[PDB]
Design a binder for these strands. Structure first.
Lengths: 534, 465, 465
RNA sequence: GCCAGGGUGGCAGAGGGGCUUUGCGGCGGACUGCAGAUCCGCUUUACCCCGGUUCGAAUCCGGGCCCUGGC
């Protein structure tokens, strides 16, 4: 709450300690669900793939390369100008863009159409043979809210969607028709085009890069490869170039990601768009990989490939200078940096069942169901736990005044009791605390037996009596409204969180089930509370 | 050059001022092409599209959304599950994938498609978590989408980036969408927002929740466009329809907001044409600053000896004080030795009734607005000298260097005398200067011009012995 | 080199394979010191302290706090207003500012001080806005503070960075502080948190709100420290006391959390000693990778002509196939012309009963763990070759280059014959290799060693005509 | 890619032309119980996809994928 500055100044100038101690008045008295870890702040997380891409952007920029966007959709003739005869082997690993043709409400389906009773559903209107011909002309998708809402009446797609189905089964026939347009299978297909417009009009050397998507089919599988991927690619254009420029670039780039040693071998492919014997494979050493269970126990892995474009290919775009091209597969680098073994799990965690909450997250999700809506009710609960803690060993029978006071203008006295004999006020598990440990929720007592849990898990800070007490106070609080006079509520054996006035949202419950985790919250609570409200 | 601290240490103990002035000794004596602006550092420049994408990632993270990668290649059945009946119409704007049948040609279409907006992928992603993670769930993704919009290019491109998000919670309304748009857009300088119901009313959104967002940006007021009032349509959102959510077993409403990246970038970096912005190389938008061009203007022939330099330097020296004197007339510029013998350099003019040097000997080469000029430092040309970038190389300067290296070639040639004169300047060559063939092609492409002309009329003679 | 597209275009129309193989023609023929790893790119490396500061800015922004700059130089009366009585004690740890009295020597202390924690400045800043901005107000600042803690250095430094924040609202509790710590710390990989009441109970915080925060980081489990269990004290917070707030006319409670930057950075980048981390140059922590050192190992004398190269190359060539042959013995390695006359190069050995080349002629120079080695590629040394970085320069390689350039000097010297032989290698010099004086000083400083020894025993003769 | 044994319900694991395990787990209810148990009720009739044999196939045959002891 706010306070008065002047008052505090004048009281502090005279009696400091008194003012300091009085400061506690401005603090907020929080109800159970307003206490840590039940309250928190959140923040968004980055996906490992995009994080890596941004780092790669920073790394290429730091070594002098400028950012560029290369063509992605390209006529397959480019793969031919680039590979020659070997092109066919390539294109067999590519995807072609196919598209749907427009239906014909004539010729094909009109000789046998106007030879029958067209439409019956009364919407009549003049021959829209034109508003339907324009569909062979220029149209779109949302154009449906047209030849209906402003034609045969009927706003939006109320009858627009259905008038189509039960009048023209012609649309339901359509099949995509391939084209010669293809999706680049590597940045290279697009570099040539981009370079043909500037290799001779810009100051040498020219250093450009681009980290973007490519596509490439592979056995028609996911566990063997992905259909789309990212290539962190670059090109260097200068008059004099050799494999050494590829090496120097690979090192300057990779060194910024923690690699410390490199080895290069000649690639058996010897692809046609590269000068013979220039296509090099690059192997790098990363500490994070040593001692790893992976196939890279020694810390070495093939991380990139490069070469020098064949003048045969450069000519096809009229490029007069040699160019060095280095490409790095982003997915693999990301796996290394953020510790992943399976590509699929790394980029598509949600789809592959790799979701997770920390113990801390689960603890935050465990709430108190019934909670006193009155400041006194809270006091009542606090006192119940209080007296329950003081006289938990008193032999049965017994009774204790926990709270005496006014509530709703009706005096009240609440008691903790034990009817049955040959036992004590509180059951043995009354002080059990709820704690989350390794994905499970446990209802346990602080015993050397469970140190591990209280030490490595996250205690919710709520015990059986705490949860029950809040339940009770709310109960008497309710009776004090039903114009009642005597209230009694008891707890016997505990089976679940419910029996402790605790709960978790339905999604969290499912998460726990899905993760094969368990909820073990049991024990003999046996606590009773009686109230007399006048 | 490296020096010895003790020398300077004690040498400074005797006389500080002398030690201080002595310091010039360690400086490097730079030759023509090693002088600013002919020497410099370079660095990468980022592209406006990707810079914007990165700003968008930051902005989404700033408001609590976590990054995700959504399915890009998808079975067309997903569009069917999401749009319902209106689906056939939608698929028309999509691209299907085709593969070449392994010849034991003609590509065979499959039933796979590229997503046309992020939504096609969101449903798939949400299906695995909407019932297993604490609410609210706030995810975003800035990635590529493909669309066959009319099949043109003057209006739209085949691929584009969608900066998209989804918000999953028990209770949602069109208000959550307005709150997200403002919080995201404010971080980009927009100050006011207006929302209007989108007439199309797509079937994957709950009827009447599909909204168009308009935002006001001061940067656009007074803009050579209809955006002159400062307002512009910048995004769209809606609450997913239970019809569609149900086909994926998602039991809660979902607020989806998508913003087209290309338009934001154009605004942030001042572009009018999308294609000129993302593909500048392909659309002739290459560009070099005046300072860049100036750096490319180099001296072709330079004296190879420390002697040669002080010679060219002296040639220049005397012409700066005797270019007036009537001709015929002659002056001694240098006298000393190099390569093993003494030499004398003369700055002269044999012709009668004229001046030693031409009236343009002092013209300076300066770049301005993409053009290279050879001009005098006159009040008439002030603006060029103050707003362009002068090379610091004058007509004589370029010539002297040639002269020097020319006698330097005579010395090693065993000669004893050399004649080197300059009359009328018609280009960079005539003044011992050049630019790489690519910069020249650049200037032509940008339709720039080179105007280096004038009466140099300066002659130098020397006799080695 | 630049080429003509038409040539390759049509030339490829006739025979692709031939055109393709012809391509090697455009590649550059690199000489010794232009070969990897002797050539490379460099780039800046950021410092761990500043990287951490930048990560902290991001983290605070991630949870909604806005950046601020707080007063750093302050009148000591502010510490008095904030700590009350306990103030005299506090001022002991602060620094006061003194100025030299303008001599019409001895500095005169003023009543101004440097802040010892961010709090001294927060109150001033809050005084101008806590009653004029919508609640809650969430501000942060990562900046320098000064402290005279005991006046040592083995335990603490004079200046340090505090990553601090304040949260102003009508209702606050110790819970808001716990929520902020977790949200901030989780972004740095901490997974579990514990809080304990700080015994000192400073008077500027409401009694009993001053809390110490402990966090668990997996990176620290199994750490060569008491942090072995994974836990460590990482920050502190409390709710400002109305006594202090009132001296600035602030009427609402304020949650303040501060985290020491140096400790976080040490954890993030793996350091044990604060000073070694922020001042590595001053504490001898300079460091070069093996690959860096390898790049600095250069060939001193290299053939200046394309002819010289193919000569040194041939010298090497025949020794790789006749280093066995018994001596005396002789072989012709090269025959052709350069500088105007033909020449013949001989690889020989005059001595009796021995081999042409020494048994170490094929030893390779390789760097490993900061040391430079001259060794044979034997199973015995495998680990050095696979985990260190070999230069790709062998004993003969370095020598041949010397040989070649040596006859090359005879040719221009008008001679007709030259004797150049090598016996026992004792260092990089004996093999025509060097490293800049600074790298050598580096290796000594790092107590590294250079071990380039062995029986080269190889002689080359040539006769120019 | 070449040899072989095989692909069962949430997990586990028998079986084998139509009827058919079973254990764990789980969900709902019951219980005078002072500690982590008891009893009753419970499913989505489970055995990949395409063909073939048959009145009928998860069980028989051929092919396509998916796991494993092998080059």
């Amino acid at each position: 709450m706010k306070f008065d500055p002047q008052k505090y100044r004048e009281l502090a100038e005279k009696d400091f300690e008194a003012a300091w101690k009085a400061g506690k008045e401005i603090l907020a008295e929080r109800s159970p669900n307003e206490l840590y870890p039940r309250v928190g702040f959140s923040f968004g997380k980055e996906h490992p793939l995009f994080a890596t891409i941004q780092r790669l952007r920073e790394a290429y920029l730091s070594i002098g390369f400028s950012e560029v966007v290369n063509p992605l959709i390209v006529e397959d003739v480019h793969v031919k100008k680039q590979f020659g005869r070997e092109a066919l082997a390539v294109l067999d690993r590519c995807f072609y863009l196919a598209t749907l043709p427009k239906p014909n409400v004539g010729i094909s389906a009109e000789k046998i159409r106007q030879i029958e009773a067209i439409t019956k559903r009364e919407v009549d209107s003049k021959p829209l043979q034109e508003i339907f011909h324009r569909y062979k002309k220029g149209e779109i998708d949302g154009d449906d809210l047209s030849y209906l809402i402003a034609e045969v009446l009927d706003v939006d797609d109320i009858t627009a969607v259905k008038i189509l189905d039960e009048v023209f089964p012609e649309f339901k026939e359509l099949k995509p028709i391939s084209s010669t347009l293809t999706l680049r299978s590597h940045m290279t297909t697009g570099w040539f085009i981009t370079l043909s417009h500037i290799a001779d009009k810009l100051p040498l050397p020219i250093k450009l890069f681009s980290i973007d998507r490519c596509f490439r089919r592979e056995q028609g599988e996911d566990a063997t490869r992905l259909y789309t991927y990212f290539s962190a690619s670059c090109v260097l254009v200068d008059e004099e170039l050799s494999v050494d420029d590829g090496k120097a670039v690979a090192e300057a780039l990779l060194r910024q990601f923690g690699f410390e040693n490199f080895r290069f071998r000649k690639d058996e492919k010897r692809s046609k768009y590269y000068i013979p014997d220039t296509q090099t494979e690059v192997f790098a050493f990363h500490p994070k990989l040593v001692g790893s269970s992976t196939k890279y126990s020694d810390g070495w892995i093939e991380i990139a490939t490069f070469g020098i474009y064949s003048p045969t290919a450069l000519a096809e775009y009229d490029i007069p200078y040699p160019v060095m091209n280095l490409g790095l597969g982003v997915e693999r680098l990301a796996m290394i940096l953020y510790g992943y073994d399976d590509v699929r799990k790394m980029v598509y965690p949600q789809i592959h069942g790799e979701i997770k909450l920390s113990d801390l997250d689960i603890a935050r999700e465990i709430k108190v169901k019934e909670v006193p809506q009155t400041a006194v009710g809270l006091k009542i609960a606090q006192s119940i736990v209080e007296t329950a803690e003081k006289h938990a060993s008193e032999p049965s029978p017994c009774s204790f005044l926990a709270f005496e006071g006014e509530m709703m203008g009706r005096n009240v006295r609440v008691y903790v009791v034990e009817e049955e004999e040959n036992t004590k006020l509180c059951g043995p598990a009354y002080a059990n605390e709820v704690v989350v440990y390794k994905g499970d929720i446990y209802g346990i007592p602080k015993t050397k037996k469970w140190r591990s849990f209280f030490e490595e898990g996250v205690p919710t800070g709520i015990r059986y009596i705490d949860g029950f007490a809040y339940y009770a106070a709310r109960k008497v609080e309710e009776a004090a409204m039903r114009e009642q006079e005597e209230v009694k509520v008891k707890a016997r054996i505990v089976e679940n969180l419910s029996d402790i006035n605790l709960y978790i949202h339905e999604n969290v419950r499912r998460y726990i089930l899905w993760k094969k985790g368990k909820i073990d919250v049991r024990g003999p609570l046996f606590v009773t509370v009686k109230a007399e409200i006048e």
